[PDB]
Symmetry: C3
Subunit: 131 residues, 3 copies
Protein backbone atom coordinates (compact mmCIF):
# COMPACT_ATOMS: atom_id res chain seq x y z
CA UNK A 1 0.00 0.00 0.00
CA UNK A 2 3.13 2.12 -0.43
CA UNK A 3 5.23 0.59 -3.19
CA UNK A 4 9.03 0.71 -3.30
CA UNK A 5 11.15 0.74 -6.45
CA UNK A 6 13.36 -2.33 -6.97
CA UNK A 7 15.73 -2.66 -9.92
CA UNK A 8 18.43 -5.21 -10.79
CA UNK A 9 21.88 -4.21 -12.09
CA UNK A 10 23.75 -6.30 -14.66
CA UNK A 11 26.58 -5.15 -16.95
CA UNK A 12 29.20 -7.02 -18.96
CA UNK A 13 31.89 -4.41 -18.12
CA UNK A 14 32.04 -6.46 -14.89
CA UNK A 15 32.73 -10.16 -14.29
CA UNK A 16 29.99 -12.75 -14.44
CA UNK A 17 28.68 -14.25 -11.20
CA UNK A 18 30.56 -17.42 -10.22
CA UNK A 19 27.65 -18.56 -8.07
CA UNK A 20 24.01 -17.90 -7.09
CA UNK A 21 23.96 -14.12 -6.66
CA UNK A 22 23.20 -10.93 -8.57
CA UNK A 23 25.69 -8.13 -9.18
CA UNK A 24 23.63 -5.54 -7.27
CA UNK A 25 20.11 -4.55 -6.22
CA UNK A 26 18.58 -1.07 -5.90
CA UNK A 27 15.70 -0.84 -3.41
CA UNK A 28 14.16 2.52 -2.53
CA UNK A 29 17.35 4.61 -2.49
CA UNK A 30 19.98 2.12 -1.24
CA UNK A 31 22.16 -0.10 -3.45
CA UNK A 32 23.52 -3.42 -2.13
CA UNK A 33 26.61 -4.62 -4.03
CA UNK A 34 28.00 -8.17 -3.99
CA UNK A 35 31.59 -8.95 -3.07
CA UNK A 36 34.01 -8.50 -5.97
CA UNK A 37 37.26 -10.34 -6.67
CA UNK A 38 40.07 -9.22 -8.93
CA UNK A 39 38.74 -11.06 -11.98
CA UNK A 40 39.10 -9.76 -15.54
CA UNK A 41 35.73 -9.34 -17.33
CA UNK A 42 37.31 -10.36 -20.66
CA UNK A 43 39.19 -13.51 -19.61
CA UNK A 44 36.99 -14.69 -16.73
CA UNK A 45 40.05 -15.41 -14.56
CA UNK A 46 41.96 -13.64 -11.81
CA UNK A 47 44.56 -11.18 -13.09
CA UNK A 48 48.21 -12.16 -12.48
CA UNK A 49 50.62 -10.15 -10.38
CA UNK A 50 49.49 -10.69 -6.80
CA UNK A 51 47.42 -8.80 -4.26
CA UNK A 52 48.13 -5.27 -5.53
CA UNK A 53 46.97 -5.99 -9.08
CA UNK A 54 43.95 -7.92 -7.78
CA UNK A 55 42.92 -4.99 -5.56
CA UNK A 56 43.06 -2.58 -8.50
CA UNK A 57 40.89 -4.85 -10.67
CA UNK A 58 38.36 -5.47 -7.89
CA UNK A 59 37.88 -1.74 -7.32
CA UNK A 60 37.57 -1.11 -11.06
CA UNK A 61 34.84 -3.76 -11.16
CA UNK A 62 32.99 -1.92 -8.36
CA UNK A 63 33.18 1.31 -10.36
CA UNK A 64 31.48 -0.16 -13.43
CA UNK A 65 28.60 -1.47 -11.30
CA UNK A 66 28.17 1.93 -9.62
CA UNK A 67 27.98 3.66 -13.01
CA UNK A 68 25.44 1.09 -14.22
CA UNK A 69 23.29 2.26 -11.27
CA UNK A 70 23.72 5.97 -12.06
CA UNK A 71 26.30 6.64 -9.33
CA UNK A 72 30.03 7.10 -8.77
CA UNK A 73 32.47 6.52 -5.90
CA UNK A 74 31.19 9.55 -3.96
CA UNK A 75 27.94 7.63 -3.28
CA UNK A 76 29.55 4.81 -1.25
CA UNK A 77 28.73 4.95 2.46
CA UNK A 78 30.32 1.69 3.72
CA UNK A 79 32.73 -1.01 2.55
CA UNK A 80 34.42 -4.16 3.87
CA UNK A 81 37.91 -5.36 2.88
CA UNK A 82 38.64 -9.10 3.27
CA UNK A 83 42.33 -10.05 3.17
CA UNK A 84 44.15 -13.38 2.91
CA UNK A 85 47.21 -11.98 4.75
CA UNK A 86 47.09 -9.22 7.37
CA UNK A 87 50.58 -8.15 6.24
CA UNK A 88 49.15 -6.72 2.99
CA UNK A 89 47.30 -4.03 4.99
CA UNK A 90 49.55 -1.11 4.06
CA UNK A 91 49.78 -2.01 0.36
CA UNK A 92 46.02 -2.46 -0.13
CA UNK A 93 45.31 0.88 1.56
CA UNK A 94 47.66 2.48 -1.00
CA UNK A 95 45.53 1.21 -3.88
CA UNK A 96 42.22 1.90 -2.08
CA UNK A 97 43.81 5.24 -1.72
CA UNK A 98 43.28 6.55 -5.23
CA UNK A 99 39.65 5.56 -5.86
CA UNK A 100 38.05 7.22 -2.82
CA UNK A 101 40.09 10.42 -2.93
CA UNK A 102 38.72 12.11 0.21
CA UNK A 103 35.64 12.01 2.45
CA UNK A 104 36.25 8.31 2.98
CA UNK A 105 33.34 5.93 3.66
CA UNK A 106 32.94 3.87 6.79
CA UNK A 107 34.94 0.65 6.63
CA UNK A 108 35.96 -2.61 8.29
CA UNK A 109 38.94 -4.83 7.50
CA UNK A 110 40.46 -8.10 8.75
CA UNK A 111 42.21 -11.29 7.61
CA UNK A 112 40.05 -14.24 6.60
CA UNK A 113 40.94 -17.94 6.47
CA UNK A 114 40.33 -18.35 2.73
CA UNK A 115 38.47 -16.80 -0.21
CA UNK A 116 36.78 -18.48 -3.20
CA UNK A 117 38.89 -19.21 -6.28
CA UNK A 118 42.08 -18.75 -4.26
CA UNK A 119 41.82 -14.97 -4.43
CA UNK A 120 43.93 -12.70 -2.25
CA UNK A 121 41.36 -9.92 -1.60
CA UNK A 122 37.58 -9.37 -1.75
CA UNK A 123 35.56 -6.16 -1.25
CA UNK A 124 31.83 -5.43 -0.71
CA UNK A 125 30.02 -2.10 -0.44
CA UNK A 126 26.77 -0.19 0.12
CA UNK A 127 25.73 3.05 -1.60
CA UNK A 128 22.88 5.58 -1.58
CA UNK A 129 21.50 7.34 -4.64
CA UNK A 130 21.59 11.07 -5.34
CA UNK A 131 20.80 13.76 -4.70
CA UNK B 1 7.52 0.16 12.48
CA UNK B 2 10.18 -0.37 15.14
CA UNK B 3 9.82 -3.64 17.04
CA UNK B 4 11.65 -6.84 17.91
CA UNK B 5 10.58 -9.89 15.89
CA UNK B 6 10.20 -13.10 17.90
CA UNK B 7 8.88 -16.56 17.02
CA UNK B 8 6.49 -18.43 19.29
CA UNK B 9 7.86 -21.14 21.58
CA UNK B 10 11.42 -20.88 20.39
CA UNK B 11 14.91 -20.78 21.92
CA UNK B 12 17.28 -17.91 21.26
CA UNK B 13 19.60 -17.47 24.25
CA UNK B 14 23.08 -18.57 23.18
CA UNK B 15 23.95 -15.01 24.18
CA UNK B 16 22.73 -11.36 24.29
CA UNK B 17 20.95 -10.79 20.97
CA UNK B 18 17.51 -10.71 19.33
CA UNK B 19 16.19 -12.77 16.43
CA UNK B 20 15.48 -9.76 14.21
CA UNK B 21 14.64 -6.04 14.21
CA UNK B 22 12.10 -4.25 12.00
CA UNK B 23 12.68 -0.51 11.50
CA UNK B 24 10.62 1.41 8.94
CA UNK B 25 10.66 -1.13 6.09
CA UNK B 26 13.97 -2.99 6.59
CA UNK B 27 14.50 -6.22 8.57
CA UNK B 28 17.91 -7.05 10.08
CA UNK B 29 18.24 -10.78 10.86
CA UNK B 30 20.87 -12.34 13.11
CA UNK B 31 23.24 -15.01 11.84
CA UNK B 32 21.66 -18.46 11.95
CA UNK B 33 23.29 -21.82 12.66
CA UNK B 34 21.87 -25.26 11.95
CA UNK B 35 20.18 -25.52 15.35
CA UNK B 36 17.00 -27.47 16.14
CA UNK B 37 14.15 -25.27 17.43
CA UNK B 38 13.05 -28.14 19.69
CA UNK B 39 16.40 -29.51 20.91
CA UNK B 40 18.63 -26.44 21.05
CA UNK B 41 21.47 -28.47 19.52
CA UNK B 42 23.07 -28.74 16.09
CA UNK B 43 21.36 -31.25 13.79
CA UNK B 44 23.37 -34.35 12.80
CA UNK B 45 24.54 -35.08 9.28
CA UNK B 46 27.24 -32.49 8.68
CA UNK B 47 27.45 -29.24 6.77
CA UNK B 48 24.83 -30.13 4.14
CA UNK B 49 22.16 -30.91 6.74
CA UNK B 50 23.11 -27.88 8.85
CA UNK B 51 22.56 -25.54 5.89
CA UNK B 52 19.03 -26.86 5.32
CA UNK B 53 18.04 -26.19 8.95
CA UNK B 54 19.69 -22.76 9.02
CA UNK B 55 17.69 -21.60 5.99
CA UNK B 56 14.47 -23.02 7.43
CA UNK B 57 15.05 -20.96 10.58
CA UNK B 58 15.48 -17.85 8.42
CA UNK B 59 12.17 -18.67 6.74
CA UNK B 60 10.27 -18.80 10.03
CA UNK B 61 11.63 -15.37 11.01
CA UNK B 62 10.50 -13.86 7.70
CA UNK B 63 6.99 -15.26 8.21
CA UNK B 64 6.77 -13.61 11.64
CA UNK B 65 7.42 -10.30 9.83
CA UNK B 66 4.92 -10.93 7.03
CA UNK B 67 7.47 -11.76 4.31
CA UNK B 68 8.95 -14.68 2.39
CA UNK B 69 12.22 -15.42 0.60
CA UNK B 70 11.33 -13.02 -2.23
CA UNK B 71 11.88 -10.12 0.21
CA UNK B 72 15.59 -10.84 0.88
CA UNK B 73 17.98 -8.34 -0.72
CA UNK B 74 21.37 -9.36 0.76
CA UNK B 75 23.03 -12.24 2.59
CA UNK B 76 26.43 -13.43 3.84
CA UNK B 77 27.52 -17.08 3.95
CA UNK B 78 30.18 -17.99 6.53
CA UNK B 79 31.86 -21.37 6.04
CA UNK B 80 34.18 -23.37 8.27
CA UNK B 81 35.77 -25.08 5.24
CA UNK B 82 36.13 -23.46 1.82
CA UNK B 83 35.98 -26.97 0.33
CA UNK B 84 32.21 -26.94 1.00
CA UNK B 85 31.55 -23.98 -1.33
CA UNK B 86 29.91 -25.94 -4.14
CA UNK B 87 27.80 -28.15 -1.86
CA UNK B 88 26.33 -25.24 0.13
CA UNK B 89 25.47 -23.36 -3.07
CA UNK B 90 23.37 -26.30 -4.29
CA UNK B 91 21.23 -26.12 -1.14
CA UNK B 92 21.12 -22.31 -1.22
CA UNK B 93 19.56 -22.40 -4.70
CA UNK B 94 16.61 -24.53 -3.54
CA UNK B 95 15.21 -21.67 -1.41
CA UNK B 96 15.93 -18.72 -3.73
CA UNK B 97 14.55 -20.16 -6.95
CA UNK B 98 15.39 -17.23 -9.24
CA UNK B 99 16.39 -13.55 -9.11
CA UNK B 100 19.14 -14.15 -6.59
CA UNK B 101 19.99 -11.43 -4.03
CA UNK B 102 23.37 -9.82 -3.56
CA UNK B 103 25.76 -11.96 -1.55
CA UNK B 104 29.23 -12.38 -0.04
CA UNK B 105 30.97 -15.58 1.06
CA UNK B 106 34.27 -16.63 2.68
CA UNK B 107 35.78 -19.11 5.15
CA UNK B 108 36.23 -18.13 8.80
CA UNK B 109 38.58 -19.58 11.41
CA UNK B 110 35.80 -20.95 13.63
CA UNK B 111 32.09 -20.62 14.41
CA UNK B 112 30.29 -20.80 17.77
CA UNK B 113 29.35 -24.24 19.12
CA UNK B 114 31.59 -25.83 16.49
CA UNK B 115 29.13 -25.17 13.69
CA UNK B 116 30.04 -25.69 10.05
CA UNK B 117 27.94 -22.91 8.46
CA UNK B 118 26.15 -19.69 9.47
CA UNK B 119 24.01 -17.33 7.38
CA UNK B 120 22.79 -13.76 8.00
CA UNK B 121 20.48 -11.70 5.82
CA UNK B 122 18.64 -8.42 5.26
CA UNK B 123 15.14 -7.99 3.82
CA UNK B 124 12.74 -5.18 2.93
CA UNK B 125 8.99 -5.23 3.42
CA UNK B 126 6.74 -5.04 0.40
CA UNK B 127 3.54 -3.27 -0.58
CA UNK B 128 2.29 -6.66 -1.82
CA UNK C 1 13.78 13.82 -2.98
CA UNK C 2 17.14 15.02 -1.69
CA UNK C 3 18.23 13.35 1.55
CA UNK C 4 20.40 14.46 4.46
CA UNK C 5 24.01 13.25 4.49
CA UNK C 6 26.97 14.32 6.62
CA UNK C 7 30.07 12.95 8.31
CA UNK C 8 30.87 12.21 11.96
CA UNK C 9 34.29 13.12 13.38
CA UNK C 10 35.04 13.75 17.07
CA UNK C 11 38.21 13.58 19.15
CA UNK C 12 36.51 11.50 21.87
CA UNK C 13 37.16 8.46 19.65
CA UNK C 14 40.43 7.32 18.09
CA UNK C 15 41.65 8.72 14.81
CA UNK C 16 41.41 6.53 11.73
CA UNK C 17 44.35 4.18 11.17
CA UNK C 18 43.63 4.15 7.45
CA UNK C 19 41.42 5.67 4.73
CA UNK C 20 38.04 5.68 6.47
CA UNK C 21 35.66 7.96 8.37
CA UNK C 22 34.38 7.25 11.88
CA UNK C 23 30.74 7.11 10.74
CA UNK C 24 28.21 8.27 8.13
CA UNK C 25 24.66 9.55 8.68
CA UNK C 26 22.39 9.17 5.62
CA UNK C 27 18.66 9.87 5.89
CA UNK C 28 18.14 8.38 9.36
CA UNK C 29 20.57 5.41 9.35
CA UNK C 30 24.10 5.52 10.80
CA UNK C 31 26.87 3.24 9.50
CA UNK C 32 29.72 2.92 12.04
CA UNK C 33 33.24 1.70 11.30
CA UNK C 34 34.76 -1.25 13.12
CA UNK C 35 36.38 -0.23 16.42
CA UNK C 36 39.37 -1.73 18.24
CA UNK C 37 40.33 -1.30 21.88
CA UNK C 38 42.49 1.76 21.16
CA UNK C 39 43.10 4.73 23.46
CA UNK C 40 41.71 7.88 21.77
CA UNK C 41 44.67 10.08 22.73
CA UNK C 42 47.66 7.81 22.04
CA UNK C 43 46.30 5.43 19.42
CA UNK C 44 47.76 2.50 21.38
CA UNK C 45 45.86 -0.53 22.62
CA UNK C 46 44.87 -0.38 26.29
CA UNK C 47 46.71 -2.86 28.55
CA UNK C 48 45.10 -5.87 30.18
CA UNK C 49 44.17 -8.20 27.33
CA UNK C 50 40.96 -9.09 25.53
CA UNK C 51 38.66 -8.13 28.42
CA UNK C 52 40.05 -4.59 28.63
CA UNK C 53 40.14 -4.21 24.84
CA UNK C 54 36.44 -5.10 24.61
CA UNK C 55 35.48 -2.46 27.19
CA UNK C 56 37.41 0.24 25.33
CA UNK C 57 36.00 -0.74 21.93
CA UNK C 58 32.43 -0.39 23.23
CA UNK C 59 33.28 2.92 24.89
CA UNK C 60 34.54 4.21 21.53
CA UNK C 61 31.28 3.10 19.88
CA UNK C 62 29.33 5.01 22.52
CA UNK C 63 31.11 8.31 21.88
CA UNK C 64 30.43 8.08 18.13
CA UNK C 65 26.74 7.34 18.74
CA UNK C 66 26.39 10.47 20.90
CA UNK C 67 28.09 12.62 18.26
CA UNK C 68 25.32 11.38 15.92
CA UNK C 69 22.49 12.17 18.36
CA UNK C 70 21.99 8.58 19.58
CA UNK C 71 22.81 6.22 22.44
CA UNK C 72 23.16 2.45 22.82
CA UNK C 73 19.38 1.92 22.69
CA UNK C 74 19.37 2.94 19.00
CA UNK C 75 21.57 0.07 17.71
CA UNK C 76 19.73 -2.52 15.61
CA UNK C 77 22.64 -4.71 14.36
CA UNK C 78 26.21 -5.50 15.40
CA UNK C 79 29.08 -7.85 14.50
CA UNK C 80 31.68 -9.20 16.97
CA UNK C 81 35.04 -10.30 15.51
CA UNK C 82 37.22 -12.47 17.77
CA UNK C 83 40.82 -13.63 17.52
CA UNK C 84 40.08 -16.72 19.67
CA UNK C 85 36.71 -18.48 19.83
CA UNK C 86 37.42 -19.49 23.46
CA UNK C 87 36.94 -15.82 24.48
CA UNK C 88 33.23 -16.02 23.57
CA UNK C 89 31.90 -16.19 27.13
CA UNK C 90 34.09 -13.43 28.56
CA UNK C 91 33.28 -10.99 25.74
CA UNK C 92 29.56 -11.73 26.06
CA UNK C 93 29.70 -10.71 29.73
CA UNK C 94 31.25 -7.36 28.76
CA UNK C 95 28.73 -6.91 25.93
CA UNK C 96 25.81 -7.09 28.38
CA UNK C 97 27.10 -4.14 30.42
CA UNK C 98 26.61 -1.79 27.43
CA UNK C 99 23.59 -3.33 25.66
CA UNK C 100 21.54 -4.00 28.79
CA UNK C 101 18.11 -4.86 27.35
CA UNK C 102 16.21 -5.27 24.06
CA UNK C 103 19.32 -6.54 22.33
CA UNK C 104 20.12 -5.82 18.67
CA UNK C 105 20.56 -8.46 16.00
CA UNK C 106 24.06 -9.89 15.96
CA UNK C 107 26.65 -12.18 14.40
CA UNK C 108 29.88 -13.46 15.92
CA UNK C 109 32.81 -15.61 14.78
CA UNK C 110 36.59 -15.97 14.96
CA UNK C 111 38.74 -14.38 12.26
CA UNK C 112 42.31 -15.25 11.30
CA UNK C 113 43.83 -11.92 12.41
CA UNK C 114 42.93 -8.29 13.14
CA UNK C 115 44.87 -5.08 12.43
CA UNK C 116 47.47 -3.96 14.98
CA UNK C 117 47.29 -7.40 16.61
CA UNK C 118 44.02 -6.67 18.38
CA UNK C 119 42.00 -9.36 20.10
CA UNK C 120 38.47 -8.06 19.31
CA UNK C 121 36.77 -5.63 16.90
CA UNK C 122 33.10 -4.58 16.72
CA UNK C 123 30.98 -2.83 14.05
CA UNK C 124 27.35 -1.70 14.20
CA UNK C 125 24.41 0.04 12.50
CA UNK C 126 21.91 2.40 14.13
CA UNK C 127 18.73 4.33 13.32
CA UNK C 128 17.74 7.69 14.79
CA UNK C 129 14.78 8.18 17.11
CA UNK C 130 11.52 9.90 16.21
CA UNK C 131 11.54 12.45 19.05
Amino acid sequence: MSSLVRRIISTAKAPAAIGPYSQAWLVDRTIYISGQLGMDPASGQLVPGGVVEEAKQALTNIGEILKAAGCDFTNVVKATVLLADINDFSAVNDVYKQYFQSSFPARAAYQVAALPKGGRVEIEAIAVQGP
